[PDB]
Structure formats: structure tokens, C-alpha cells
Write an enzyme that holds these catalytic residues in place. Structure first.
Site, short mmCIF file in Angstrom:
data_model
loop_
_atom_site.label_atom_id
_atom_site.label_comp_id
_atom_site.label_asym_id
_atom_site.label_seq_id
_atom_site.Cartn_x
_atom_site.Cartn_y
_atom_site.Cartn_z
N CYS B 109 50.95 21.68 6.50
CA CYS B 109 51.56 22.87 7.08
C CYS B 109 52.76 22.56 7.98
O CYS B 109 52.61 21.85 8.99
CB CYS B 109 50.52 23.66 7.90
SG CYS B 109 51.20 25.11 8.75
N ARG B 112 53.19 24.27 12.13
CA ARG B 112 52.22 23.95 13.18
C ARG B 112 52.73 24.02 14.63
O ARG B 112 51.94 23.95 15.56
CB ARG B 112 51.52 22.61 12.89
CG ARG B 112 50.48 22.70 11.79
CD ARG B 112 49.85 21.33 11.51
NE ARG B 112 50.70 20.50 10.67
CZ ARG B 112 50.60 19.18 10.59
NH1 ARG B 112 49.67 18.54 11.30
NH2 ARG B 112 51.40 18.48 9.80
N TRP B 281 53.24 33.89 9.00
CA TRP B 281 54.41 34.53 8.39
C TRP B 281 55.06 33.51 7.45
O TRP B 281 54.85 32.29 7.59
CB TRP B 281 55.41 35.02 9.45
CG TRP B 281 55.86 33.98 10.44
CD1 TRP B 281 56.81 33.01 10.23
CD2 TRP B 281 55.42 33.82 11.80
NE1 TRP B 281 56.96 32.25 11.36
CE2 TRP B 281 56.13 32.73 12.34
CE3 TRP B 281 54.48 34.48 12.59
CZ2 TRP B 281 55.93 32.29 13.65
CZ3 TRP B 281 54.28 34.05 13.90
CH2 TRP B 281 55.00 32.96 14.41
N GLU B 286 58.97 29.45 0.18
CA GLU B 286 57.73 29.78 -0.54
C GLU B 286 57.94 30.93 -1.54
O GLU B 286 57.45 30.87 -2.67
CB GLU B 286 56.58 30.15 0.42
CG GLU B 286 56.14 29.08 1.40
CD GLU B 286 55.15 29.63 2.43
OE1 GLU B 286 53.94 29.65 2.14
OE2 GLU B 286 55.58 30.06 3.53
#
Ligand code: HEM
Ligand code: HEM
Ligand code: W67
Ligand code: W67
Ligand code: H4B
Ligand code: H4B
Ligand code: CL
Ligand code: CL
Ligand code: ZN
EC number: 1.14.13.39
Lengths: 403, 405
Positions: B109, B112, B281, B286
């Protein structure tokens, strides 16, 4: 057991059984993966590597078990037992050099692996002789822009004797002059070699793309300085097919990518000077060399010329400028009739290579972070392909700087 | 040098050492002989107790009461509970710490930097599929917040000895249907073909659009999953337009506002939360690069390049790169216009470099998966490309878990 290897775009699966042939440790452990690290942190042995390589060679010519194969093994054995070392026949060296390229996990160009011109330069005794071989290598490889892959092999390392070395990281490098007002003029990647040259008596330039002289070193001798004849170094002016202002940037790159700082290991023997060349994939020049922040760093300049909103990341001004720079490299090399391959075509050939190798050897060692191009990653097929990374020999290896 | 991985940034020339990796108690897939870093899915009360003790230690360290009377007492209480029942239960504050720490520990991720600001909804009182649905809608409304998105996680009851799991069958709370066609093609999102057919099997009347929002299949313990339709007003979507290419709006593309992952397992102190959907969000790549441009996804690259009048007959025109950039811009521009939270790949990666520095100071390292952290376009134009990273598993953790069917 053996790694299950999946392609996520097509859903196809293979298994790598080739990795079982690895005899050298990489940096990962079950506790933590260090796959992203660029460099490594740091007689019966020689004989077993020698025997394995002779075995590779004779299998490759389909003559395993032949009398010739048995005799060669005894020669190697007798030579090591007596002298602590041995020597390759030219045909073995040729096979060895090709396998090292083939085995190189970070190279996206390996579909070309079996087509490599091998210059045997093991009868070299001086820096001046090294220079002559290098000029011939460049002349052959450049070939008026119709590039041909080649390698020149200088004498192997011998115990209790200094190495033959080429100090430059590539045969062609642009100078980086560090002006005391912090900055760097030229290529920041070559600051140290530029300074080493000047210290050894080079008369420096003051341009952005000054071709450096070569520092060549014969064993236990001070390095010697040789200037490459300008007609040997084919270069390509960068312009853009539609943006007429682009040529005014005064940008250019050289035709020939020839790495000269790596060690070639074959059958336990080590060749500390063995420069190799091929042809460029466009992103090396257009993305990394020109757009890296710690290189020429031209992104902002090109953007301001394209009248782009430099104020916010969210306008994607960096992505747009970068695409155009890569386009100009491709366009310019194509106009100059100099061999170059774009990242889409290169990665498509690598997928075919993975498939060739799966049938041929049951796998292919590959380093995903290096195989995937620095722009447009997931737009290429290799992004979606799982890869296994491991060390096979013959191999190209890094080695410390001579200074 | 120190006996820990040495980590270098090649842009700045700076060096760190990761000592945090010493705390890893679980192996990944690599060996000294071969690196498997690029693989997407790599393959008793005594065991519970040690995981439990380690977590309680972690909790008490995080509140600076390590070695305290309350620490020894809480340890004693966990052992007693496990001894008499085979499992134990987390206090509210321990669950909150655990959820944030699982996020903090997630190697894949890039978001973070935000780890400390996570709204944790405690839903361990949930006893029905209908109630799961109420909790999920409440989550969606809170996290969505009319476009001003807020990170949240909702935690349903843990796995229990001899009792069915709570599961959400859908991989995300919001998913577009994927209808397999007569010719073999897919209408909608090919990623969602299977869940779509499961929904139909369980009684859903299917649409025929490219963007039909799927119902939720929700499973309470030892019961067949029940089907729940999300009321459309709860699902915020953004029609995609381009700031200068006026025809882009005519393509009728859109995406939903809330990325909410719902099929992962939240593990804390050995306890297993099979249903714990979490949301943040989006990072614009992506949607713009992967979901819209992957060949096995919506695959719109050639459509857009044709509209832009590019040379799609040759790789060297860089038509794919050009179209992909404009699609990402359209995503960013459309979310900004709609006032819905979103971050581009440059801002996200810069914030992640900041995160790395925070964690070097706070814990002596940060587990990170390079291939996932570097964005799918413009890789080396972002600072993370030039940053070496160490990947390893820490707990609390978000983990993959097998599909319920
Ligand atoms: C013929 C066309 C070739 C293409 C298109 C090609 C492409 C590439 C690219 C893009 C890289 C990454 C370099 C970087 O990012 O710094 C690379 C690395 C490498 N290539 Fe190739 N290459 C070619 C020929 C060759 C040849 C002839 C050899 C050896 C005989 C070779 C061996 C290697 C090695 C050892 C590396 C890793 C260098 C390092 O780690 O510093 N390649 N190649
Ligand atoms: C706040 C804004 C956030 C941003 C911008 C962000 C960004 C991202 C991105 C770009 C990915 C890659 C996903 C993919 O390529 O499939 C990812 C994965 C992931 N994120 Fe974050 N995220 C955010 C919040 C969160 C939160 C709140 C959690 C949990 C509480 C979380 C946990 C995870 C996990 C576990 C993955 C890996 C999922 C997998 O491997 O399937 N993230 N995130
Ligand atoms: C034969 C060959 C062909 C080709 N297209 N590129 C190469 C690599 C050239 C190259 C490009 N960028 C950077 C480097 C330096 C790499 C240094 N190592 C230590 C990471 C080298 C070699
Ligand atoms: C909380 C959160 C925020 C965010 N921006 N993205 C995510 C991940 C959403 C997401 C995006 N693309 C693809 C997937 C599928 C995950 C595939 N895993 C299972 C391998 C999931 C989660
Ligand atoms: C940190 C990271 O491993 C490093 O920057 C790598 C990433 N991938 C790369 N890929 C290529 N082809 N060349 C590189 O120099 C790098 N650098
Ligand atoms: C083969 C490879 O591991 C796979 O395609 C990965 C690469 N990196 C990724 N990175 C992110 N963020 N998301 C992904 O789905 C992937 N896919
Ligand atoms: Cl280069
Ligand atoms: Cl998504
Ligand atoms: Zn690894």
C-alpha cells in the site's frame, strides 16, 4: 518445490525447473526479500565449476560422452592440479560469452542472445594493444548505424597479479564537470570518471556532451589515456517530428551502448575486462538518461516549452513531457538510420524469449524490476508476467572499481 | 557495517539500514537460491498464545506501559481466557490499535502516510446478514461523506471454534458487473465475471450495461449468503470527462468514488477477522491505467487512441503511452471537478517517501513491495522507483483468504 509461474493477462501457467541449476546465492531469505537492491552488499571449487562448464559446452554441441569430451575434462583437470588454473579454447569462450548474455536476468534484449560476435583479445599485453582492439570493436559494432552485437574478451585474471581493466563504465561516456556553485555541467553519472581522466592528464572541455577519453589498465601498471577518434563515435542529434523547438534544446546521444566495467565469469575463470555492446532500447535514453533527476533532468525545460502547467503534479506535465522526449529519441534514431528498439517492441520480444527458453531449458532467470520499462509499465506484457530471479553461470557480474 | 539490510536511494545517494525486519515472525516465498518477489499470490492454543502475547506486548509498548502491572495483568487474562475456551477477546482499544497497525504493516500500500487516521467501526456485535448490510451502508455513508472521503474499516465477529465465518463474498463493496457474451467477449468488467454469475445464481436479476453496480452477497455464520442491493444514492460515481478533448465525455465512461476492499482477512494477535471491509480514496492510476487500460480489463486504449487520431499500426508512435496519459488526466480532472477525493501518482509517491522517513525514525524501517509501490505508468518519474525497499511480513496483518465457495 519448484516455482509456479503465472501470467495474469492470459491466465497461462508454467513451472521453472531451471532454477534448480543455480549454484550461487542471491540476497533474499525467507525472512525478507531484497530483490530491489541494485548491488550486492559484498582448487576443488575451481575444478567443479570447470567440469560443469565443459559439460555445458559438450552438451551444447550434442557430443556429451564423446572421446573429445573425456579428453578435454582430463586436460582441464591436469592443468588445474599442476598450475592452480586452466585456459579455454576459443570455441568454448564463444559459447561461454553467449550463455552469460543468455543468463543475464536484467537484460530485456535476450531474444538476440545467439547472435553475438566474439573478439578473442586474450593475446593482449599492453594498454596500447587494448586500445587497438577497442577501436576495432567499436568500428565493427557501429557498422554505419546498422548495429551488431559484439564482445571483446581481454586476458583473464591470474592469482598474485593485477587485472586488465577498462576504468570507464562504458566505451562512450559524456563528461560531467562539477562547477563549485553546486551544480554539474554534462552527465552527473560520470563526474568521478571525468575527474579521474583530468587527473591523468586529459585536457577537459566545457560542453554538455563532451565524449570522454578511455582509461585503460594493464596489470600492475598505471592506467593510460586514449582519445577515441571522433569518426569512430557515431552520434544522433535529437529532434522531434512535430515540435520544431525541440532541436533547439541542443540534445544528442551516441549510437553504441557498450558496457565495459563488468566481469565475465566462465567455468570459474574470470575476465575482468570484456566490454560488450548491442543497440539501445529507447527508454534508456529518453526516460532514464534525459529525465532522471540526478542525470540531465530535462523534464522541466521540455514542459515549459510545451507550455504545460508546471504548478501542479495533477496536470501530469511530467508524464506528457516524458512521452514526447521518448518520441524524439525514436524519431531521431530512425531518421539517422541507427538501430533502436522501442519499449513495446522490446518487451514483446522478451515474452517470445521467455516462451523459447521455457521449451529449451525449462525456465528463464529474470529480474522483474529491471525487465519492466521505466514509463508505461502495465502497458507492456511483461508487467503482467510473474518472473523468477536466480544466478546461473556463465555470468556477467559486477566488480569493484580499480581506483 | 551494521548487520541489517542496507537500503539505498539512488537519486539522493542516502543510505539507511532496516532493523525492523528483525521483528518478522513469518516467512515469505524467497530463498537464497531464487527470488519470488514478483509473484502476486505466494503459497492450537500454544501457537495462539505466543501470537497473542506478542500482540499484547505491541499494544502496551504503543501506550508506553510495557512491563507495567496492567501489562502483566492483561497478559495473565489472555492466557486464562485461552486456557478455558481455546480463544480470547480483544478490548476495544486493542482492536483499534490492531486495525491501524495492520494498515501500517501492509507492504503493498502506497497510501500508508495516512495510517494513523483510520476510523474503526466495531461491529463485533453483528449477528445476521441483514445487520451486516446495515453496518456496510453506514460504513459507505460515513466513508463517502459526499465526496470528502474518510478512511474507515468495519470489523465483524472473529472466526470462532466450530462455527461458520462471517464473509462478504464480493471482492469490493462497489463492483461493476461482467456479463459473459455469446461470442465469448465480456460486457462490463471482466475482473468481475465470476461474482456476477454467483449473484445471478443466487437470484439477482442482471442488467446489460458496462457499468451495472453489483448487489452484495453477504454471509452470516453457517447460513447461505443473502443478496443485498445497494440503494443507488449511496453509491457515488463520477462520469469521466477530459479538460480539453471535448469528445472524451461522449465515451460514457465512469468510475465509483469509494475503493473498499472486502475479501481480505484481518489478523490480530492470532485472532482472525474473516469479514473486515476497509476503504480509503483512490490513486488515479488504479482507475486510469489498470482498470480502464489493462488488456484483460476494460481495455479502452485503442478506442481512445483512434479518437485522438494516433498511428495504432506501429509501436514506435507511442500511441499507447499517449492515450494512457490522457485517460489518467481525464480521471484526475473528473474527480477534481466532482469534488471527490483523489491523489495522482506523483503526489502519492512523494507522500510515501515521507512515510518511509517517518517509519525509519519510529521503527527503524518499513516493509515495502517495490513492484506494487512503483506506479504502472511513469515509473522512474516518481521518487519511489529510485528507492531500494525491504519486503517482509509483520503482524497485525491484512491477508489473502480463499474464496468462500
Ligand atoms: C542487442 C540488443 C540489446 C538490448 C535491446 C538490450 C537491452 C538492455 C536493457 C534495456 C538493459 C537495462 C540497462 C539499464 O537499465 O541500465 C540491459 C542490461 C543488461 N544487458 Fe542487454 N541489451 C542488448 C544487448 C546485450 C548484449 C549483447 C549483452 C552481453 C553480451 C547484454 C547484457 C546485459 C547485461 C549484463 C545487463 C545488466 C547491466 C547491469 O546490471 O549494469 N545485453 N540490456
Ligand atoms: C487513504 C488512501 C489510500 C490510498 C491512496 C491507497 C492506495 C493503495 C493502492 C494504489 C494500492 C494498490 C492496489 C492494487 O494495485 O491492486 C493499495 C493496496 C492496498 N491497501 Fe491502500 N490505500 C489507501 C488506504 C488504505 C486503507 C484505509 C487500508 C486498510 C485499512 C489500506 C490497505 C491496503 C492493502 C491491505 C492493500 C493490498 C491489497 C491487495 O494486495 O490486494 N489502504 N492501496
Ligand atoms: C549491451 C547493452 C545494450 C543496451 N541497450 N543497454 C545496455 C546497458 C547500458 C546502460 C544503460 N543505462 C545505465 C547503465 C549503467 C548501469 C550500471 N549498473 C551498475 C546498474 C548501463 C547494454
Ligand atoms: C483501501 C484501498 C484504497 C485504494 N486506493 N485501493 C485499494 C485497493 C483496491 C483495488 C484496486 N485494484 C485492484 C484490486 C484487486 C486486488 C487484487 N489482489 C487481490 C491481488 C483492489 C484499497
Ligand atoms: C531501487 C530500484 O531497484 C532501482 O532503482 C532499479 C529499478 N529498476 C531498474 N530497471 C532498469 N532497467 N534499470 C535500472 O537502473 C533500474 N533501477
Ligand atoms: C506480475 C506482477 O507481480 C503483477 O502484474 C503485479 C505487478 N505490480 C502491481 N502493482 C500494483 N499496485 N498492483 C498490481 O496489481 C500489480 N501487479
Ligand atoms: Cl546508457
Ligand atoms: Cl479498483
Ligand atoms: Zn526476493
Amino acid at each position: 518445490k519448484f516455482p509456479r509461474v503465472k501470467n495474469w493477462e492470459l491466465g497461462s501457467i508454467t513451472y521453472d525447473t531451471l532454477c534448480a541449476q543455480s549454484q550461487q546465492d542471491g540476497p533474499c531469505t525467507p525472512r525478507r526479500c531484497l530483490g530491489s537492491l541494485v548491488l550486492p552488499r559484498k582448487a576443488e571449487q575451481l575444478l567443479s565449476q570447470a567440469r560443469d562448464f565443459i559439460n555445458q559446452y559438450y552438451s551444447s554441441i550434442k557430443r556429451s560422452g564423446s572421446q573429445a569430451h573425456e579428453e578435454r575434462l582430463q586436460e582441464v583437470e591436469a592443468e588445474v592440479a599442476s598450475t592452480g588454473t586452466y585456459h579455454l579454447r576459443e570455441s568454448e569462450l564463444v559459447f561461454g560469452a553467449k550463455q552469460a548474455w543468455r543468463n543475464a536476468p536484467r537484460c530485456v534484449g535476450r531474444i538476440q542472445w545467439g547472435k553475438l560476435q566474439v573478439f578473442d583479445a586474450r593475446d593482449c599485453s599492453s594498454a596500447q594493444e587494448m586500445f587497438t582492439y577497442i577501436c576495432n570493436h567499436i568500428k565493427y559494432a557501429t557498422n554505419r548505424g546498422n548495429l551488431r552485437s559484439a564482445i571483446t574478451v581481454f586476458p583473464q585474471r591470474a592469482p598474485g597479479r593485477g587485472d586488465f581493466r577498462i576504468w570507464n563504465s562504458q566505451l562512450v561516456r559524456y563528461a560531467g564537470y562539477r562547477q563549485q556553485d553546486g551544480s554539474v555541467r554534462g552527465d552527473p553519472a560520470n563526474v568521478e570518471i571525468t575527474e579521474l581522466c583530468i587527473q591523468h592528464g586529459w585536457t577537459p572541455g566545457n560542453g554538455r556532451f563532451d565524449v570522454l577519453p578511455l582509461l585503460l589498465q594493464a596489470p600492475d601498471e598505471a592506467p593510460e589515456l586514449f582519445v577515441l577518434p571522433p569518426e569512430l563515435v557515431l552520434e544522433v542529434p535529437l529532434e522531434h517530428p512535430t515540435l520544431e523547438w525541440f532541436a533547439a534544446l541542443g540534445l544528442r546521444w551516441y549510437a553504441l551502448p557498450a558496457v565495459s566495467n563488468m566481469l565475465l565469469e566462465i567455468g570459474g575463470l574470470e575476465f575482468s575486462a570484456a566490454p560488450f555492446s548491442g543497440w539501445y532500447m529507447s527508454t534508456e535514453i529518453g526516460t532514464r538518461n534525459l529525465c532522471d533527476p540526478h542525470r540531465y533532468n530535462i523534464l522541466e525545460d521540455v514542459a515549459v516549452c510545451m507550455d504545460l502547467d508546471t504548478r501542479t503534479t495533477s496536470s501530469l506535465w511530467k508524464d506528457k513531457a516524458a512521452v514526447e522526449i521518448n518520441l524524439a529519441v525514436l524519431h531521431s534514431f530512425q531518421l539517422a538510420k541507427v538501430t533502436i528498439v522501442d519499449h513495446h517492441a522490446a518487451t514483446v520480444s522478451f515474452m517470445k524469449h521467455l516462451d523459447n527458453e521455457q521449451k529449451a531449458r525449462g525456465g528463464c532467470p529474470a529480474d522483474w524490476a529491471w525487465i519492466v520499462p521505466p514509463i508505461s509499465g502495465s502497458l507492456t506484457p511483461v508487467f503482467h508476467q510473474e518472473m523468477v530471479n536466480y544466478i546461473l553461470s556463465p555470468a556477467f557480474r559486477y566488480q569493484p572499481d580499480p581506483w
